[PDB]
Design brief:
Length: 157
């Protein structure tokens, strides 16, 4: 249930019009960084070819048999480690993605979904990033909880 290599590629398949491109790239890259800070994994954005983790913005039905649901409800989903669609993280474009507190924060959502792309389940600690409910936390004080660190290190340490 894990990536069996420690150099992992991602590609941004497409950009949400909600946010400037620069802010999308920065959110995503920072989100990956959160995990590469507590494991030996290295993440590399690529701009051509097939990436391990593909990052997709889409609405409703988008060709994976798990349609999204409009504004609210499900925000995003992600497939666990594997080939093809494995690892891929999809973000519901009917949300309003933002760099701060308005709408839904892309960074925080990405940290969570990349958790799942890496093989994590959910946490019972409301402080954890892998807690199952979205809430805006102070990104200046953001930090992985002990539960996240133990989970991720059990897979990749
Ligand atoms: C679990 C849940 O909250 N479901 C909500 C319900 O969701 C239906 C789908 C059930 N569900 C939710 C999830 C968790 N999500 C994904 C996940 O775990 O990644 C999976 C689909 C892959 S998620 O989209 O909801 C999700 C994504 C990111 C995060 C996250 C982001 C940042 C930090 C931490 C967590 C949390 C949840 N799994 N199944 O929608 C309803 C309507 O939504 C509106 C208008 O906001 C919710 O009603 C509200 C807000 O009161 C409803 O709340 C209830 C009763 O469960
Ligand atoms: Ca939705
Ligand atoms: Ca993949
Ligand atoms: Ca949107
Ligand atoms: Zn999908
Ligand atoms: Zn989740």
């Amino acid at each position: 249930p894990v990536w069996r290599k420690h150099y992992i590629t991602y590609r941004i398949n497409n950009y949400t019009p909600d946010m400037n491109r620069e802010d999308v790239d920065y959110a995503i890259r920072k989100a990956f960084q959160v995990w590469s800070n507590v494991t030996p994994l290295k993440f590399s954005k690529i701009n051509t070819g097939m990436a391990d983790i593909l990052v997709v913005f889409a609405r409703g039905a988008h060709g994976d048999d798990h349609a999204f649901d409009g504004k609210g409800g499900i925000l995003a989903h992600a497939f666990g480690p594997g080939s093809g669609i494995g690892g891929d993280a999809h973000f519901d474009e009917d949300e309003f993605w933002t760099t701060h507190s308005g709408g839904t924060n892309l960074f925080l959502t990405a940290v969570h979904q990349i958790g799942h792309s890496l093989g994590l389940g959910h946490s019972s600690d409301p402080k954890a990033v892998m807690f199952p409910t979205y809430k805006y936390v102070d990104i200046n004080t953001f930090r992985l909880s002990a539960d996240d660190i133990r989970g991720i290190q059990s897979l990749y340490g």
